[PDB]
Scaffold this motif. Structure first.
Motif, PDB file in Angstrom:
ATOM      1  N   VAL B 183       0.832  -1.198   0.000  1.00  0.00           N
ATOM      2  CA  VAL B 183       0.000   0.000   0.000  1.00  0.00           C
ATOM      3  C   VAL B 183       0.870   1.253   0.000  1.00  0.00           C
ATOM      4  O   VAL B 183       0.552   2.238  -0.676  1.00  0.00           O
ATOM      5  CB  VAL B 183      -1.008  -0.012   1.167  1.00  0.00           C
ATOM      6  CG1 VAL B 183      -0.315  -0.091   2.520  1.00  0.00           C
ATOM      7  CG2 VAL B 183      -1.919   1.199   1.091  1.00  0.00           C
ATOM      8  N   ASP B 184       1.984   1.240   0.741  1.00  0.00           N
ATOM      9  CA  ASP B 184       2.839   2.421   0.799  1.00  0.00           C
ATOM     10  C   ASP B 184       3.442   2.759  -0.559  1.00  0.00           C
ATOM     11  O   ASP B 184       3.374   3.904  -1.013  1.00  0.00           O
ATOM     12  CB  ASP B 184       3.952   2.192   1.825  1.00  0.00           C
ATOM     13  CG  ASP B 184       4.828   3.417   2.026  1.00  0.00           C
ATOM     14  OD1 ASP B 184       4.288   4.535   2.148  1.00  0.00           O
ATOM     15  OD2 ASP B 184       6.067   3.257   2.060  1.00  0.00           O
ATOM     16  N   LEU B 185       4.029   1.771  -1.231  1.00  0.00           N
ATOM     17  CA  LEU B 185       4.596   2.016  -2.549  1.00  0.00           C
ATOM     18  C   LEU B 185       3.518   2.307  -3.586  1.00  0.00           C
ATOM     19  O   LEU B 185       3.763   3.068  -4.530  1.00  0.00           O
ATOM     20  CB  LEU B 185       5.507   0.853  -2.940  1.00  0.00           C
ATOM     21  CG  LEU B 185       6.947   1.032  -2.403  1.00  0.00           C
ATOM     22  CD1 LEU B 185       7.050   0.802  -0.899  1.00  0.00           C
ATOM     23  CD2 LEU B 185       7.962   0.136  -3.118  1.00  0.00           C
ATOM     24  N   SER B 186       2.330   1.700  -3.452  1.00  0.00           N
ATOM     25  CA  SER B 186       1.222   2.032  -4.340  1.00  0.00           C
ATOM     26  C   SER B 186       0.827   3.497  -4.202  1.00  0.00           C
ATOM     27  O   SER B 186       0.671   4.204  -5.201  1.00  0.00           O
ATOM     28  CB  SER B 186       0.027   1.121  -4.047  1.00  0.00           C
ATOM     29  OG  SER B 186      -1.179   1.659  -4.562  1.00  0.00           O
ATOM     30  N   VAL B 187       0.664   3.975  -2.964  1.00  0.00           N
ATOM     31  CA  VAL B 187       0.347   5.384  -2.754  1.00  0.00           C
ATOM     32  C   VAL B 187       1.525   6.265  -3.150  1.00  0.00           C
ATOM     33  O   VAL B 187       1.341   7.457  -3.423  1.00  0.00           O
ATOM     34  CB  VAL B 187      -0.122   5.644  -1.307  1.00  0.00           C
ATOM     35  CG1 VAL B 187       1.009   5.506  -0.319  1.00  0.00           C
ATOM     36  CG2 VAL B 187      -0.775   7.015  -1.195  1.00  0.00           C
ATOM     37  N   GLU B 188       2.735   5.700  -3.200  1.00  0.00           N
ATOM     38  CA  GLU B 188       3.869   6.404  -3.789  1.00  0.00           C
ATOM     39  C   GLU B 188       3.659   6.594  -5.283  1.00  0.00           C
ATOM     40  O   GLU B 188       4.134   7.577  -5.860  1.00  0.00           O
ATOM     41  CB  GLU B 188       5.181   5.653  -3.545  1.00  0.00           C
ATOM     42  CG  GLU B 188       5.636   5.623  -2.107  1.00  0.00           C
ATOM     43  CD  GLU B 188       7.042   5.089  -1.950  1.00  0.00           C
ATOM     44  OE1 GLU B 188       7.736   4.906  -2.974  1.00  0.00           O
ATOM     45  OE2 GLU B 188       7.457   4.853  -0.799  1.00  0.00           O
ATOM     46  N   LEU B 189       2.945   5.664  -5.908  1.00  0.00           N
ATOM     47  CA  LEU B 189       2.566   5.739  -7.305  1.00  0.00           C
ATOM     48  C   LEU B 189       1.385   6.695  -7.457  1.00  0.00           C
ATOM     49  O   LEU B 189       0.764   7.125  -6.481  1.00  0.00           O
ATOM     50  CB  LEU B 189       2.249   4.332  -7.820  1.00  0.00           C
ATOM     51  CG  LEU B 189       1.971   3.947  -9.270  1.00  0.00           C
ATOM     52  CD1 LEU B 189       2.384   2.503  -9.468  1.00  0.00           C
ATOM     53  CD2 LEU B 189       0.500   4.114  -9.633  1.00  0.00           C
ATOM     54  N   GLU B 190       1.096   7.048  -8.708  1.00  0.00           N
ATOM     55  CA  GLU B 190       0.145   8.119  -8.988  1.00  0.00           C
ATOM     56  C   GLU B 190      -1.253   7.797  -8.475  1.00  0.00           C
ATOM     57  O   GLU B 190      -1.949   8.684  -7.968  1.00  0.00           O
ATOM     58  CB  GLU B 190       0.121   8.415 -10.484  1.00  0.00           C
ATOM     59  CG  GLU B 190       1.476   8.819 -11.010  1.00  0.00           C
ATOM     60  CD  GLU B 190       1.974  10.108 -10.395  1.00  0.00           C
ATOM     61  OE1 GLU B 190       1.145  10.986 -10.078  1.00  0.00           O
ATOM     62  OE2 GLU B 190       3.203  10.243 -10.226  1.00  0.00           O
ATOM     63  N   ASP B 191      -1.697   6.549  -8.616  1.00  0.00           N
ATOM     64  CA  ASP B 191      -3.088   6.237  -8.321  1.00  0.00           C
ATOM     65  C   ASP B 191      -3.339   6.329  -6.824  1.00  0.00           C
ATOM     66  O   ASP B 191      -2.559   5.822  -6.013  1.00  0.00           O
ATOM     67  CB  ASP B 191      -3.452   4.841  -8.824  1.00  0.00           C
ATOM     68  CG  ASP B 191      -3.911   4.841 -10.267  1.00  0.00           C
ATOM     69  OD1 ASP B 191      -4.020   5.934 -10.859  1.00  0.00           O
ATOM     70  OD2 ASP B 191      -4.174   3.750 -10.808  1.00  0.00           O
ATOM     71  N   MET B 192      -4.438   6.981  -6.471  1.00  0.00           N
ATOM     72  CA  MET B 192      -4.801   7.326  -5.105  1.00  0.00           C
ATOM     73  C   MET B 192      -6.119   6.707  -4.675  1.00  0.00           C
ATOM     74  O   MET B 192      -6.228   6.218  -3.548  1.00  0.00           O
ATOM     75  CB  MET B 192      -4.844   8.860  -4.972  1.00  0.00           C
ATOM     76  CG  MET B 192      -5.182   9.430  -3.599  1.00  0.00           C
ATOM     77  SD  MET B 192      -6.934   9.346  -3.169  1.00  0.00           S
ATOM     78  CE  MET B 192      -7.595  10.715  -4.120  1.00  0.00           C
TER      79      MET B 192
END
Lengths: 182, 286, 50, 50, 50
Positions: B183-192
RNA sequence: UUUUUU
């Protein structure tokens, strides 16, 4: 990676008033709520279990029981949750003489309990102020900056709405209360 | 008695710490029979305690590994390399990889060699490709997901690392690293608007506490937006999970101070600084 | 106000940067929201016009 | 006192309290249905030929 | 529709005939005195001014 | 001929 990239990506893929049943729902009171905010010397009965189960989620119950000593378990579990969360709670009673021994019992049972009445003003800094509704109605019309910290308002004897010279106080209070106050 | 013996040996290998290590020793005695090449594996499990049992584990492994102990002797040497520095690892990796040519049985030696080598060696092909072969050897039950999680640690095409974080958390559920990292790296990515769905779903199966890593993230997610009621409730749940982490108290205090409350924010910040008195920000905020 | 900064992951205060406040010119006797300044001082709990 | 404490404040009217009182609950229960029916029957009148 | 609206109008007139409310309903000093008073607001403030 | 609060 080019061959490994594919070799990894191929592996990766409205009602507004709910009449909760008197006897049926609760079967697991200890499966959830394993660390109760308050500890009794006995077992909480069915309706007290249901009220506590909804007080955990910051809901707004309307308990309607017979005996006054079955209700005060809900009224002090809400104060244990208020002291756990650092917030504040207001217990409001109509009779001036009824809100004195309540002060004694809530100060003996846990921590700080202030009392406010026509003449008494013990500790107006605690987190369990005990008041008569005409004082809460008077500090709702101004701000008073106590309203900034509330979680629960425990209306004690709500069948005084039927009184003829004081029933308007309970509805000026129930109307003027902001939304963040359960 | 075959099915029960294998289950008992596997439980001994996979069991808990020192008290369960003694239970594992008791199980090994209860199953003191032929095919002694499993005792060394129990010994490796006993090495998980290293207190009055590793010496017995070392003796048991030495006693068992007599005829060939082919997998067992190499695995024991790798374990010795892990206990010591990575010198032995260089010999063990080459011998094990050259001798036992496989992908899934080889994946256990690949994970042991990568754990020994990860100290100093770069190992862009010895262990990283070993983890790639282990990922191609993904087993049915609890034998190759953690390898994929450990393979995607910090680098090497982080976008598939986010994909196999989602997979490594979907497959392996008990751990609270791959999911939090995912989740942390995903939220580091553009999609929110995708992180919130994940957090809501994980929260739904949260029984009573024990999801502090989820509550905290979603509370912060509501704190970045102006939704203070939800943020406060979420953070209260997170603190009920564990009422000692000062980060939760400090973030909850900021939540209270963002909306009206002034003396409840003060109380929470005082509690946050009371423990961990090193943090200046909390005392300053008080 | 000189508000703090937060590292986007595992938040830590990188540094303090000044930003513009937004809820000034709001007062306790002309605004009814929980953003107004707290009050004059320690004050009578009830019975307060203005 | 109620009239004074509501005349005193500008964004609150005394009729707000009368609308929200329990003795007006039966009459004022279905207000959203009345307003939606009004806005959707004004459309239906726009039908007839002149 | 409000049952009590005419009585509100009559109360505002009684307030305005004494000196407590300006035309078009803005509280005067006597109004703010009778606002923060416990009981018998009208009679007590009238006794004080007299 | 009971009961009550700012």
């Amino acid at each position: 990676l080019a061959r490994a990239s594919s070799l990894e990506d191929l592996v990766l893929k409205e009602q507004w008033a709910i009449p909760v049943d008197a006897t049926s729902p609760v079967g697991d009171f200890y499966r959830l709520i394993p660390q109760p905010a308050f500890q009794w010397a006995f077992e909480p009965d069915v309706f007290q279990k249901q009220a506590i189960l909804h007080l955990e989620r910051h809901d707004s119950v309307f308990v309607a029981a017979h005996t006054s000593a079955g209700k005060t378990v809900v009224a002090e579990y809400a104060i244990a949750l208020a002291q756990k969360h650092m917030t504040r709670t207001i217990y409001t009673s109509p009779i001036k003489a009824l809100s004195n021994q309540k002060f004694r019992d809530f100060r003996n049972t846990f921590g700080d309990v202030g009392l406010l009445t026509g003449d008494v003003q013990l500790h107006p800094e605690a987190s369990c102020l005990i008041m008569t509704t005409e004082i809460l109605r008077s500090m709702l019309y101004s701000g008073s900056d106590v309203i900034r910290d509330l979680e629960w308002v425990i209306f004690d004897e709500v069948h005084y709405i039927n009184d003829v010279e004081r029933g308007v106080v309970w509805e000026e209070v129930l109307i003027m209360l902001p939304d963040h106050v359960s | 008695l075959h099915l029960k013996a294998e289950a008992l040996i596997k439980l001994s290998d996979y069991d808990s710490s020192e008290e369960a290590i003694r239970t594992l020793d008791q199980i090994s005695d209860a199953d003191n029979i032929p095919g002694l090449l499993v005792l060394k594996s129990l010994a490796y499990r006993n090495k998980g305690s290293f207190d009055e049992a590793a010496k017995i584990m070392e003796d048991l492994l030495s006693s068992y590994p007599d005829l060939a102990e082919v997998h067992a002797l190499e695995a024991l040497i790798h374990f010795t390399k892990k206990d010591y520095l990575q010198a032995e690892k260089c010999f063990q990796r080459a011998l094990e990889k050259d001798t036992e040519v496989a992908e899934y049985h080889y994946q256990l030696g690949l994970t042991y060699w990568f754990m020994g080598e990860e100290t100093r060696k770069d190992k862009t092909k010895a262990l990283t490709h070993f983890l790639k072969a282990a990922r191609l050897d993904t087993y049915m039950g609890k034998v190759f997901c953690y390898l994929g999680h450990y393979y995607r640690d910090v680098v090497g095409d982080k976008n598939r690392a986010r994909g196999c974080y989602r997979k490594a958390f979907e497959l392996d559920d008990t751990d609270a690293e791959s999911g939090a990292a995912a989740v942390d790296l995903s939220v580091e990515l553009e999609d929110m608007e995708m992180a919130l769905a994940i957090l809501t779903t994980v929260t739904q199966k949260a029984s009573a506490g024990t999801a502090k890593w989820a509550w905290l993230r979603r509370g912060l997610y509501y704190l970045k937006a102006g939704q203070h009621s939800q943020a406060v409730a979420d953070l209260q749940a997170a603190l009920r999970a564990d009422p000692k982490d000062f980060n939760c108290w400090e973030s909850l205090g900021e939540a209270y101070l963002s909306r009206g409350g002034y003396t409840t924010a003060l109380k929470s910040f005082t509690k946050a600084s009371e423990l961990n008195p090193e943090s200046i920000y909390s005392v300053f905020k008080v | 106000d000189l508000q703090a900064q937060r590292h986007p992951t595992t938040g830590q205060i990188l540094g303090y940067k000044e930003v513009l406040l937004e809820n000034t010119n709001l007062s306790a006797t002309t605004s009814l929201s929980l953003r107004r300044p707290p009050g004059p001082a320690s004050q009578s709990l009830w019975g307060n016009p203005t | 006192t109620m009239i004074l404490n509501l005349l005193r404040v500008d964004a609150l009217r005394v009729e707000d309290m009368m609308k929200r009182s329990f003795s007006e609950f039966p009459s004022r229960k279905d207000s959203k249905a009345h307003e939606q029916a009004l806005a959707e029957l004004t459309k239906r009148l726009g039908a007839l030929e002149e | 529709s409000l049952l009590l609206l005419p009585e509100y109008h009559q109360r505002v007139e009684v307030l305005r005939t004494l000196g407590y409310v300006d035309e078009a309903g803005t509280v005067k000093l006597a109004g703010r005195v009778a606002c923060a008073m416990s009981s018998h607001e009208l009679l007590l403030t009238e006794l004080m001014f007299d």
